Amino acid sequence: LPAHGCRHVAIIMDGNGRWAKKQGKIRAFGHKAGAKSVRRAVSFAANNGIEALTLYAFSSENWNRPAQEVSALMELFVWALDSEVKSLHRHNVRLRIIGDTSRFNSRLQERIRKSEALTAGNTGLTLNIAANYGGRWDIVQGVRQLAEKVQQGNLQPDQIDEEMLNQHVCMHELAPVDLVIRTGGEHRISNFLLWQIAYAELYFTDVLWPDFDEQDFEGALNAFANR
C-alpha cells in the first residue's frame, strides 16, 4: 500500500563491466561495485514497502562465456550465500533462488537449500535471486509439471488454461511483477522473466548498475507511480 504502489520489482543489473572499463579497471572491480549496488537496492526495497525484489543474477545463457567470467560470478554467488544470508535473515528477508539449481554442484545446492530454509518463514521482503535462470526454461518447467499431472491421470489437456500455467511458473505465489528495471543501456528482456512480465511496466535507464542508487530506485518507482 505504499504511495508508489509498486509491490514486486524485477531488475536486470547490467553495466558492471562497462562501469569498470570506463575507469581503466578490470572486470572484477565492476563486480565488487555491483555487489555494493545489490546491497543498496535490497536495503532500499525492504525500507520502501516492496513485497518482492527479483534480481537477474545468472542467466542460463551466461554459462557460455569465459571461465574467468563464469567462475567469478559463481564465486560471488557462493560468497553472497556464505556471507550475506545472516543479514537477510536479520532483516526478516525471505530468500529464494530461482532457476535450474540442479546444474550447480551439490555443494552449492546445499548452501542454497540451507539459505532458503533458514529464511523460509520470514515475512518481510522476498528476495528472489535468479541463478542459472531463463524465462523460457521457467515456462518449460511449469509445463512439465502440468504434463506430469496429465500423466498421473489427474489432468486433462483441454483443462490446461492460462491460470493453470500461471500457478506453476516461478514466483506464482508472489504479487505480480509491477516493474522491470534494466540498467546499462540495453533495451531488451534477454530471456529474463517472460511469462511474468505480460503486464509489467518496462523501464530502461543508461545508468550502469554500480551507479544505480537509492535516488535512481525512487526515480524508477516514481516513473512507475506515474503510469
Ligand X SMILES: CC(C)=CCC/C(C)=C/CC/C(C)=C/COP(=O)(O)OP(=O)(O)O
- Residues belonging to the binding site for Mg(2+) are 14, 187, 201
> One symbol per residue from 22 to 61: x for binding a copy of itself (CB under 8 A), - otherwise; what is it?
----------------------------------------
- State the nearest-atom distance from the C-beta of 8 to ligand X, in Å: 17
- State the nearest-atom distance from the C-beta of 144 to ligand X, in Å: 26
SS (H, E, C) 106-169: HHHHHHHHHHHHHHCCCCCCEEEEEEEECHHHHHHHHHHHHHHHHHCCCCCHHHCCHHHHHCCC
81 sits near ligand X (criterion: CB under 6 A): yes
Task: Judge whether 125 and 47 are in contact, CB under 8 Å.
Answer: no
CA distance 118 to 53: 18
The residue from 14, 138, 178, 216 that is catalytic is: 14
Of 38-77, which residues contact ligand X (CB under 6 A)?
Answer: 38-39, 42-43, 57, 73, 76-77
- Cα-Cα-Cα-Cα torsion 51, 100, 120, 172, nearest 10 degrees, comes to 40
154 sits near a copy of itself (criterion: CB under 8 A): no
Annotated binding-site members for isopentenyl diphosphate: 201
175 sits near a copy of itself (criterion: CB under 8 A): no
